[PDB]
Amino acid sequence: NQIDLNVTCRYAGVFHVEKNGRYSISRTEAADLCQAFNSTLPTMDQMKLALSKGFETCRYGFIEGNVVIPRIHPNAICAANHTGVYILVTSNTSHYDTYCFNASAPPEEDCTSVTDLPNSFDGPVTITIVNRDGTRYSKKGEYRTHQEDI
Ligand SMILES: O=C(CCC1CCCCC1)N1CCOCC1
Structure with missing residues (x-):
């Protein structure tokens, strides 16, 4: 019972x-x-x-x-060579990655690694945060509140 979460800067x-x-x-x-x-x-x-x-x-x-x-x-293979915030218009399907916003982070580029999953709740899943540099943080918990997502 494991979930890997690859995160960025x-x-x-x-x-x-x-x-x-x-x-x-x-x-x-x-x-x-x-x-x-x-x-x-x-x-x-x-x-x-x-x-x-x-x-x-x-x-x-x-x-x-x-x-x-x-x-x-x-880049020809990333958003059909567009620049800016490219918006997906037509797709048959519903599952993607996600972006997240943390108001307490630094104002500009923060390329330090993520070393905590601070607001996960009690649960049985081994959740592992994987940074781009390969460093990892794991903790047992759960974050999904909707049954259809489990
Ligand atoms: O885990 C944390 C804070 C723990 C440390 C504290 C300073 C930033 C790097 C890591 N976050 C998750 C997602 O990004 C914003 C905050």
Whole structure:
């Protein structure tokens, strides 16, 4: 009973979270997952400020109201070579990664590692935070509040 959560740098408090190395989070699970990091789904304004500070990924993830990819450098295989906060318009499917926003993070680029899952609740799952540099933090708990996500 294990969940891997790959996390990034925080940019103006915004960061990316990928679950189990594949697109696998529903919108309900995404809000619960950010709450476990004492965080919320970013607003579009919060995401645009994060982009302006250096944030980009090559993965679709939820924000409040949309599924997006923040892009700085054009790349043909990331958001069809677009720049800016690219918004997914047409998809058949419902599961993506998520973005999260923590208001207490530093104002600009924070590329230190994540060393805690501060607001997870009691549960049976071994949850492992995996940083880009490979460092890990594990703790037993749960974050999902909706049965359909378990
Ligand atoms: O776990 C924590 C805080 C513990 C430490 C405290 C300083 C920042 C690095 C790690 N967070 C989860 C998601 O990003 C914002 C905060």
